[PDB]
């Protein structure tokens, strides 16, 4: 639709922290939009991308794709400032076909957003226990 | 039998410290069960595995195998980012044959558990003196 | 003869410090006895070896050999504990022949122990000045 | 002539510091004499060499050569002692011929010792400005 300052509420292990994002333009090379947290150093900030795609003569299917990464700085050595030690990636891809209606496309998104809060799935991610 | 919270008492040089473990599922790829200490970071915790095996057309013998490792963290560089300095393993394998009764299988376990507390053996491990 | 706790007195630049050693068995692979200082970590302790040898069909001479090493440990920043950074070794080999009597063998040892306290030799070692 | 404790006065940016040196023998391998500052660790001390040479059947010219180096050491970071980080070498070579008298040989030394205190030369070394 149109980029804006996407705000977010009730995020965390408790669900009390918030997070605000700012738009940072659309890359016209490959259609990838971007959002970012208002940080200072451009390698210590959270970012979110999103990029729809279109069927060519090769692929013949739509493909929505969302990426999230979260660097965490630490390890100040000496008196120079902080540098990145770890990463935490994410990925979501959709593969809707051509003649699909919109109830199906909403149903997939709805059940994914509901299934990311089931007790099995937070047992799987937050504790790294395999489903058994 | 069935996994549960295996508790342990009188462990140490003095025999006063305790240790509690929690079950973390059975890997169905190779039958290896697992236990673990309730830690936060998944590379700074003690773990114990155990895996019985069965005779195939190649091996023709049962084989019980137990592994123990104990990493030791250094938090010199800051609590948020500790690095494992060094490790310390263990290994126990049994090789009982097919027609063995159960008194023999209990006798081997009993004499191993008794021989790991003889003065010769704690002279060997705790001081690294060769038996002479 | 027989290993025991070899004690030592009047050692140092002033000759006031002492040092005590403990026996740690005889390696039967190559006849090398060992002594050690009662330390905790097995890479931060002083050690002394001694190993007589016998004439084979190839060498035809006795060969007494004594080795001494003294590791130095300091702890660098952001590290939980001591490491080893410099060592100072030593070596003494004797090559007595077959028909030698015992007065000669005592005379060599006596003049070596006397010559390691002459002013020329402590000028050579403790100051690294070449003999000129 | 003969080695002795060469003392020095009025050295520095202000010309108030002093420096004393001690003889440390003549290397008979290549005629290179040596002086040194009375330090403890043999890699953290200033040293000065000097070595005359003689005409062979190949070179046919005398060659006096003087070398100076000054290591500098930064202080402890943990407790482990002083290390060497940078060096500052120097070099002076002379190439007097065979039939040269002594007034010429004194004149070269005199004008070099006078020219190392001209304002152009201390503008060149102490500020690293090229002569322009």
């Amino acid at each position, epitope marked *: 639709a149109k980029l804006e300052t996407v705000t977010l509420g009730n995020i965390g292990k408790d669900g009390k922290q918030t997070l605000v994002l700012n738009p940072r333009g659309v890359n016209p090379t490959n259609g990838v939009a971007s959002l970012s947290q208002a940080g200072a150093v451009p390698a210590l900030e959270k970012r979110v991308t999103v990029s729809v795609s279109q069927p060519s003569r090769n692929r013949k299917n739509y493909k929505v794709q969302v990426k999230i990464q979260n660097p965490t700085a630490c390890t*100040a050595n000496g008196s120079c400032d902080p540098s990145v030690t770890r990463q935490a990636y994410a990925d979501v891809t959709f593969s809707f076909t051509q003649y699909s209606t919109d109830e199906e496309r909403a149903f997939v998104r709805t059940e994914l957003a509901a299934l990311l809060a089931s007790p099995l799935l937070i047992d799987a991610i937050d504790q790294l226990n395999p489903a058994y | 039998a069935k996994l549960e919270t295996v508790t342990l008492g009188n462990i140490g040089k003095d025999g006063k410290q305790t240790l509690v473990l929690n079950p973390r599922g059975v890997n169905p790829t190779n039958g290896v069960a697992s236990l673990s200490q309730a830690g936060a970071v998944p590379a700074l915790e003690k773990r114990v595995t155990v895996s019985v095996s069965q005779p195939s057309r190649n091996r023709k013998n049962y084989k019980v195998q137990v592994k123990i490792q104990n990493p030791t963290a250094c938090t010199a560089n800051g609590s948020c980012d500790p690095s494992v300095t060094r490790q310390a393993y263990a290994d126990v394998t049994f090789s009982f044959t097919q027609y063995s009764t159960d008194e023999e299988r209990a006798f081997v376990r009993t004499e191993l558990a008794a021989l790991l507390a003889s003065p010769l053996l704690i002279d060997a491990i705790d001081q690294l003196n060769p038996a002479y | 003869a027989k290993l025991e706790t070899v004690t030592l007195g009047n050692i140092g630049k002033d000759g006031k410090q002492t040092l005590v050693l403990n026996p740690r068995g005889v390696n039967p692979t190559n006849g090398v006895a060992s002594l050690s200082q009662a330390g905790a970590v097995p890479a931060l302790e002083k050690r002394v070896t001694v190993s007589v040898s016998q004439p084979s069909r190839n060498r035809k001479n006795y060969k007494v050999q004594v080795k001494i090493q003294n590791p130095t440990a300091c702890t660098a920043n952001g590290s*939980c504990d001591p490491s080893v950074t410099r060592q100072a070794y030593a070596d003494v080999t004797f090559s007595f022949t077959q028909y030698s009597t015992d007065e000669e063998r005592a005379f060599v040892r006596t003049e070596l122990a006397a010559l390691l306290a002459s002013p020329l030799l402590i000028d050579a070692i403790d100051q690294l000045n070449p003999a000129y | 002539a003969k080695l002795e404790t060469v003392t020095l006065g009025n050295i520095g940016k202000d010309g108030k510091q002093t420096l004393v040196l001690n003889p440390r023998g003549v290397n008979p391998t290549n005629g290179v004499a040596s002086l040194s500052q009375a330090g403890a660790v043999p890699a953290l001390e200033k040293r000065v060499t000097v070595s005359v040479s003689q005409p062979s059947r190949n070179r046919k010219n005398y060659k006096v050569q003087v070398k100076i180096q000054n290591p500098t050491a930064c202080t402890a970071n943990g*407790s482990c002692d002083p290390s060497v980080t940078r060096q500052a070498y120097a070099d002076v070579t002379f190439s007097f011929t065979q039939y040269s008298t002594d007034e010429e040989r004194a004149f070269v030394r005199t004008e070099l010792a006078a020219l190392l205190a001209s304002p152009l030369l201390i503008d060149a070394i102490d500020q690293l400005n090229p002569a322009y």
Partner: antibody, heavy 116, light 104 residues
Framework: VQLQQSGAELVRPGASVKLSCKAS????????INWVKQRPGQGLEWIAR????????YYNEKFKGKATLTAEKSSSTTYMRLNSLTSEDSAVYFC????????????WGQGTTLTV | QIVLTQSPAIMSASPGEKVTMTCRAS???????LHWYQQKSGASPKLWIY???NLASGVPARFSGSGSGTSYSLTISSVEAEDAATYYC?????????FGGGTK
């Protein structure tokens, strides 16, 4: 999780003192421990810092030869020693625990005054 | 090596106003290293703002620090009674730490 220091005291000048604050409620050798001087009429400043699991002391250059401090691992305390006492130092002395990424001080203890 | 200046030293209290104190360094103290503490009239201090942006646990809703560079500030909106005692600030750059002068 807390830590308490000591009571009030006074010494006559020229002497030397001991101070201590004992920790409780966490594993002792895993966090740094500092000391902090607050002269009462003025702003408050920092003096020394040591890690108990090793021996590593870094100190302020104003008070470089004034204070020495050690740490005993068994009783889980930390001793600090002054010398050549005078009427220049008469203040409350704090000790606080931190770890390291954003260097700030977690947990302050109640202060120990000192008079000369 | 680094010197702080907190430009007010005394302030007045009225329960509806909007008050703000600032601080200024003598060099480029980096962000995310500097903090704010409030000390009561007769007790040990405690944390108020860490890394100049977010808040501690027992902090109420309305105090918010800001600033980028070498001149930072804390802004109080809707002050009430039993709030203002002292406000120090301190940062760590290079090596010896240094605290603020103080304000109230």
């Amino acid at each position: 999780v807390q830590l308490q220091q000591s009571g009030a005291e006074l010494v006559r000048p020229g002497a030397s003192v001991k101070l201590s604050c004992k920790a409780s409620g966490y594993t002792f050798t895993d966090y740094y421990i500092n000391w902090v001087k607050q002269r009462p009429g003025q702003g408050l400043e920092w003096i020394a810092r040591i890690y108990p699991g090793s021996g590593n002391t870094y100190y302020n250059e104003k008070f470089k030869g004034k204070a020495t401090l050690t740490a005993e691992k068994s009783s889980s305390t930390t001793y600090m020693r002054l010398n050549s006492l005078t009427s220049e130092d008469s203040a409350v002395y704090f000790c606080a625990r931190d770890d390291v990424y954003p260097f700030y001080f977690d947990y302050w203890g109640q202060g120990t005054t000192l008079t000369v | 090596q680094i010197v702080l200046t907190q430009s007010p030293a005394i302030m007045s209290a009225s329960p509806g106003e909007k008050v703000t104190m600032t601080c200024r360094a003598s060099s480029s103290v980096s962000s995310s290293y500097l903090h704010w503490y409030q000390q009561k009239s007769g007790a040990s201090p405690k944390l108020w703002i860490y890394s100049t942006s977010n808040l501690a646990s027992g902090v109420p809703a309305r105090f918010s620090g800001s600033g980028s560079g070498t001149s930072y500030s804390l802004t109080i909106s809707s002050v009430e009674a039993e709030d203002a005692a002292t406000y120090y600030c301190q940062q760590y750059s290079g090596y010896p730490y240094t605290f603020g002068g103080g304000t109230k």
